[PDB]
DNA sequence: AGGGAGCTTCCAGGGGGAAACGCCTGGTATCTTTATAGTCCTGTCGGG
């Protein structure tokens, strides 16, 4: 079953019928981030209503807002976050009516995008690739050992769906992070050339070389592991075809192979785009420096 | 270094200075989801400007909207998504000026929350604990080996 | 030991005083509506 069981028209009809939307102005986003920071400093991962109100007061202070109606504004903000599926509220009779709050997977993902300083680490990728290689190798050995529907579900499907797929998604996010980093560097090089292009030549060459080395090192690492990961996916596919198959395992393996191809292809494409820019900046600098001679 | 290097007041000041905000109306959110779906069906994880415009046209049809200025409306929506950090645009001289688009980690996280049907699994938890147990065991053996 | 009356102590009853609760009025926040003005597009025509 395609992760997205619905076609574009069906999804559009479904979204339209459920009236989904998200509204996080700077203050609300700051409050969410403050809640995320406060939750990370705690031992129980739970926040009371009073603690959330204190956090809202700090945001309001930070925005230099009137102390009038702050308890009301905090309640409206808390209700808005719950209504927007950012917070889960637990109302227990045992807690004398005091509600307990926890951030939802959505509220966490959003807050982390802004607060977590995510930079591309080669070590991280090498580690992730190591875990997926071991998980795929175990799943391939389990598929080759053969077994019943319970064995194929517990030792092959579960590791592919609940472990390998997650790791591949994490790698794809790391690539999308790298993509944002490249666009940021292009803006910095243009600024350096507008301030003092003569002194900026060494700094621009450093930024171009550091980015190029990183992209290449990454691609080298993906290519080295990619062949072993594909071989293990093929071993699982061959073992599945030999044991009468399972349409669920075949589709899952096909999806993982498609993601792996996307992950490998992205690196080469990013290198070509960076090379085009690098050549252009070098040509520009040479034209600016060397061709005027007086 | 705490994952969140900044205290709450510092973060609030930083957020205020950078002016970060999210506004996701039904139509734009539907367009984002349509883009996310279209990207998942592709082999290269890349979308051209014409393909994004075709996707917007389908959303507009699904919302029963006027076919007038759809190309403009689509450009406004695409620029809004890029301006909101949901899409990364690549403009290469080699591509004769044709821009290539990819969804940002943010645009993906948001689209997946709505489209991905997420339900809890013990098998998954058992596998995750097994992997972490092996990774922690190797790290402990490496720490005990010294170096 | 039983029965009644006196002294002494504690509870019951009265009276005051203010707060709290309940209700209304207006203010403050929030949101919507309405209008205006922009911005861009589209269309037409004419000219090149």
Residue numbers in the entry:
A (entry chain C): 1 to 294
B (entry chain D): 1 to 147
Show the paper's wording.
MukBEF is an obligate dimer, formed by two MukB2E2F monomers held together by their MDs and MukF N-terminal winged-helix domains (nWHDs). Focused sub-classification of the particle images revealed a DNA-bound structure. The DNA was captured directly at the open gate, while the proteins adopted a conformation virtually identical to the open-gate state. DNA-binding surfaces were largely contributed by MukE and MukF, and to a lesser extent by the root of the ν-MukB neck. The DNA was not entrapped inside the complex but bound at its periphery without contacting the top surface of the heads. As the captured DNA is positioned at the open neck gate but not entrapped, we reason that entrapment may be achieved by ingestion through the gate. We propose that the DNA-bound structure obtained here represents this capture state. Starting with the ATP- and DNA-bound capture state, we envision that upon ATP hydrolysis, the MukB subunits revert to their apo conformation. MukB is now free to sample the space around the DNA, and as its straightened neck is competent to bind the MD of MukF, the neck gate will eventually close. This results in an overall rotation of MukB that wraps MukF around the DNA and generates the holding state with DNA entrapped inside. Transition from the capture state to the holding state retains a short DNA segment at the center of the MukBEF dimer.
MukBEF folds the chromosome of Escherichia coli and related bacteria. The SMC protein MukB dimerizes at its ‘‘hinge’’ domain, which connects via the long coiled-coil ‘‘arm’’ to the ABC-type ATPase ‘‘head’’ domain. The heads are bridged by the kleisin MukF, whereby the C-terminal winged-helix domain (cWHD) of MukF binds the ‘‘cap’’ surface of one MukB, and the N-terminal middle domain (MD) binds the coiled-coil ‘‘neck’’ of the other MukB. MukF also recruits the dimeric KITE protein MukE.
